[PDB]
């Protein structure tokens, strides 16, 4: 769509109405808009750095910067065809934001598929309030989950306790297993202790599933019978 002119120049068109006398009374917005001018450039802006990984955009490595031989054993003595194509488009294309943590996140849930079954709430509370010390995995305010492992791994590599990401990741994974085992026992024991003091429960999870399956299996019984009678008659033909 064409860059519109009439929406941002309401003040100038209105001023012509007032100066000529076509409009007798100044509108209430008139003074406010005059003091706060609209932005009217609507230009495309170049960008020279990917904010996520700090990669520089718009830099060409000259042959003088590649004095040594390549992986093929050949020296570079002239620009290649790619170096001779103008790359202005890269300055204007929104950069693809990338994060190392994304790679670890995909790994964690590939190694632990059932962690996906633990519901996650994507609704944020207040990102600005998060005061986390990742020297430990547990934090007040957030659940224990895969993200706890990833942030712990980053802290280890950031503090240089471990050098390889794999080693830091494995170290964090074991801390995660220990915390998961203490919670699996606290829940089992809490249920056992409550039943031993006379706690009664209406429906268990297993019972809930049986009831839901019965509702479905009852509708399925009717349809099967109906469709095993239309077939018999239709086949009789």
């Amino acid at each position: 769509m064409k860059i519109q002119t009439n929406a941002v120049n309401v003040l100038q068109r209105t001023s012509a109405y007032l100066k000529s006398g076509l409009l007798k009374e100044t509108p209430a917005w008139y003074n406010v808009v005059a003091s706060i001018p609209p932005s009217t450039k609507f230009t495309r802006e170049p960008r020279f750095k990917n904010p996520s990984n700090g990669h520089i955009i718009g830099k060409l490595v000259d042959v003088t910067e590649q004095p040594h031989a390549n992986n093929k054993g050949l020296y570079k003595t002239r620009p290649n065809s790619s170096d001779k194509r103008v790359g202005v488009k890269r300055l204007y294309r929104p950069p693809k934001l990338t994060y190392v943590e994304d790679r670890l996140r995909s790994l964690f849930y590939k190694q632990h598929p059932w962690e996906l079954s633990r519901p996650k709430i994507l609704v944020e509370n207040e990102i600005g309030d998060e005061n986390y010390d990742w020297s430990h995995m547990l934090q007040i305010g957030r659940p224990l989950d895969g993200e706890s492992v990833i942030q712990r791994t980053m802290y280890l590599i950031k503090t240089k306790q471990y050098g390889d990401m794999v080693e830091a990741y494995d170290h964090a994974r074991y801390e995660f297993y220990a915390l998961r085992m203490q919670e699996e026992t606290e829940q089992q024991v809490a249920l056992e202790e409550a039943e031993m003091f006379g706690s009664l429960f209406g429906v268990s999870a297993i019972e809930h599933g049986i009831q839901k399956e019965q509702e479905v299996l009852d509708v399925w019984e009717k349809k099967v019978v109906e469709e095993t009678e239309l077939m018999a008659a239709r086949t009789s033909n």
Binding site: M1, A28, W29, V32, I36, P51, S52, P95, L97
Partner: protein
């Protein structure tokens, strides 16, 4: 979605992530402050402010804003 991009918004985009364009909140904040000052000015001047929103669920916000 980046597939639905209207390239005239290029200057507002911070980047693309998970198949969508990420809006630059630093610009959103500056634009928001400017827009807020306009509303305050018109309100303090006695002008008529109309809030238009026709997507489901917006009525409650629209009524209280008015």
């Amino acid at each position: 979605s980046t597939s639905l991009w209207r390239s005239s918004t290029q200057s507002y985009i911070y980047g693309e992530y998970k198949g969508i364009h990420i809006i630059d909140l630093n610009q959103t904040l500056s634009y928001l402050k400017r827009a807020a000052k306009v509303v305050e000015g018109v309100s303090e001047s006695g002008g008529i402010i109309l809030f238009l929103g026709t997507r489901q669920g917006q009525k409650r916000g629209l009524e209280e804003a008015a």
